[PDB]
Swiss-Prot record, chain A:
Highest taxon above the source species: Viruses
Job description of the protein: Plays a pivotal role in viral transcription by stimulating both nsp14 3'-5' exoribonuclease and nsp16 2'-O-methyltransferase activities. Therefore plays an essential role in viral mRNAs cap methylation.
Entry's localization field: Host cytoplasm, Host perinuclear region; Host cytoplasm; Host endoplasmic reticulum
Annotated ranges, domain ExoN/MTase coactivator: 1-130
Binding site for Zn(2+) 7: C74, C77, H83, C90
Name of the protein in question: Non-structural protein 10
Residues holding Zn(2+) 8: C117, C120, C128, C130
Highest classification ranks of the organism: Viruses, Riboviria, Orthornavirae, Pisuviricota, Pisoniviricetes
Summary of subunit composition and partner proteins: Forms a dodecamer and interacts with nsp14 and nsp16; these interactions enhance nsp14 and nsp16 enzymatic activities.
Swiss-Prot record, chain B:
Assembly notes: Interacts (via N-terminus) with DDX1. Interacts with nsp10.
Binding positions (Zn(2+) 15): H255, C259, H262, C277
Originating gene: rep
Location of the ExoN domain: 70-285
Purpose of the protein: Plays a role in viral RNA synthesis through two distinct activities. The N7-guanine methyltransferase activity plays a role in the formation of the cap structure GpppA-RNA. The proofreading exoribonuclease reduces the sensitivity of the virus to RNA mutagens during replication. This activity acts on both ssRNA and dsRNA in a 3'-5' direction.
Protein name: Guanine-N7 methyltransferase nsp14
Residues reported to bind Zn(2+) 14: C205, C208, C224, H227
Species in which this protein is naturally found: Severe acute respiratory syndrome coronavirus 2
Binding positions (Mg(2+) 1): D88, E189
Length: 131, 285
């Protein structure tokens, strides 16, 4: 009974981050020790003529990005653990995340390490035009 | 090829919306095309769902520098025999709003302690994962008729994990700088550990130089077995699965080959006692 949500390639990393006191540090340390990035993310088929904003209500990938379902790019959603913000709610689940094509191999790691510019809505270092 | 780890145990006849599904596998079929998913404006997100996620299938085979391994070799467990605590859990089945996973009910230890927990699960919602009480039924059978009254005599997990830390601290402070849980078919016990164990790099006690065996969420602090008062988590525990030592049959039949003083009362603590007993007889004779 029930419906499988995961693949065996993610068992080790999800189990490791599911038990950690600091899941974010655990995942970065897992990658640093040669571990593979979390796979089975929700990658979107899109026109690639989108605005290029980081977190959107519809896929907004441009020619330099890949669009993904937001919950699938969130380590806390992927591990079914508490979210680090004081309210305990997610900012990626329910939205689409645009990830640079060069970082599309590790969408979970990208969202953990990067910040969205509050002024232009693009990722800092990956499309943020202002200083 | 799929795993049972994080299996969705809800009875919802549809998958999830692309923005809410944790994985490609969990996205509803309407959105799938050519190995990918599509956004369909007009088919909205669900804002009321409650989906029980299964904690059966953890695999602790990580190789990360600075992080100790939970499962140790037989030779390392022998060296730390003073840290041995037999551990067994009798679980109940998810029912009504969910089906397909087991939840901890009676946690038994070789110290003779039994703790009853309120059947609690990890329930995905549009916003987060909600650790909360779920509808559960005791296993279908007559050897599990002792579990029926326990479905109402359970404690919330915030109290249960405090009592486990308290019992381990009282037992092990004068014996060891660690805990080694001695298991038989570790699967459900490892699942149960998600409810009271945390892992990370080796730490020291806040009040002394001894290694940290406990962790407190409330204060974000670490403690040894001597200073763990009020602590809620077991930190960096060790363990071993006695079943994997080449045994042919079940726990009781292998235990009874060497020992005749531990009868089966059919309770979780009894299996935990028999596990540690068998481990001692096998390792030291
Ligand atoms: C009908 N249910 C599904 O399609 C599903 C598939 C995988 C995970 C969760 C739900
Ligand atoms: Mg048992
Ligand atoms: Zn999330
Ligand atoms: Zn900007
Ligand atoms: Zn101390
Ligand atoms: Zn015995």
């Amino acid at each position: 009974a029930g419906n499988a949500t995961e693949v065996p390639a993610n068992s080790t990393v999800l189990s490791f981050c599911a038990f950690a006191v600091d899941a974010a540090k655990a995942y970065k340390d897992y990658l640093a020790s040669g571990g593979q990035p979390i796979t089975n993310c929700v990658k979107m088929l899109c026109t690639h003529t989108g605005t290029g904003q980081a977190i959107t209500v519809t896929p907004e990938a441009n020619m330099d990005q890949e669009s993904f379902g937001g919950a699938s790019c969130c380590l806390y959603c992927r591990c079914h653990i508490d979210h680090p913000n004081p309210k305990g709610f997610c900012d990626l689940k329910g939205k689409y995340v645009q990830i640079p094509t060069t970082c599309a191999n590790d969408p979970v790691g990208f969202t953990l390490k990067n910040t969205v510019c509050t002024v232009c809505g693009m990722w800092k270092g990956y499309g943020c035009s202002c200083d | 090829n799929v795993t049972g780890l994080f299996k969705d145990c809800s009875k919802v006849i549809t998958g999830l919306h692309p923005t809410q599904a944790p994985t490609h596998l969990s996205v509803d079929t309407k959105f799938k095309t050519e190995g990918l998913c599509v956004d369909i404006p007009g088919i909205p997100k669900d804002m009321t769902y409650r989906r029980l996620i299964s904690m059966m299938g953890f695999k602790m085979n990580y190789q990360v520098n600075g992080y100790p391994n939970m499962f140790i070799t037989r030779e390392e467990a022998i060296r730390h025999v003073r840290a041995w605590i037999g551990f067994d859990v009798e679980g109940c089945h998810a029912t009504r709003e969910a089906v397909g996973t087991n939840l901890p009910l009676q946690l038994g230890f070789s110290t003779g302690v039994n703790l009853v927990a309120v059947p609690t699960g990890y329930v995905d919602t549009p916003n987060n994962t909600d650790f909360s009480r779920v509808s559960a039924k005791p296993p279908p059978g007559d050897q599990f008729k002792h579990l029926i009254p326990l479905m109402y005599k359970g404690l919330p997990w915030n109290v249960v994990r405090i009592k486990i830390v308290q019992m381990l601290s009282d037992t092990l402070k004068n014996l060891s700088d660690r805990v080694v849980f001695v298991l038989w078919a570790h699967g459900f016990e490892l699942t149960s550990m998600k409810y009271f164990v945390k892992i990370g790099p080796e730490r020291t006690c806040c009040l002394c130089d001894r290694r940290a065996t406990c962790f407190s969420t409330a204060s974000d602090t670490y403690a040894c077995w001597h200073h763990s008062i009020g602590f809620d988590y077991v930190y960096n525990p060790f363990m071993i699965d006695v079943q994997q030592w080449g045994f042919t049959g079940n726990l009781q039949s292998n235990h009874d080959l060497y020992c005749q003083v531990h009868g089966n009362a059919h309770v979780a603590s009894c299996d935990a006692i028999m596990t540690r007993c068998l481990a001692v007889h096998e390792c030291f004779v």
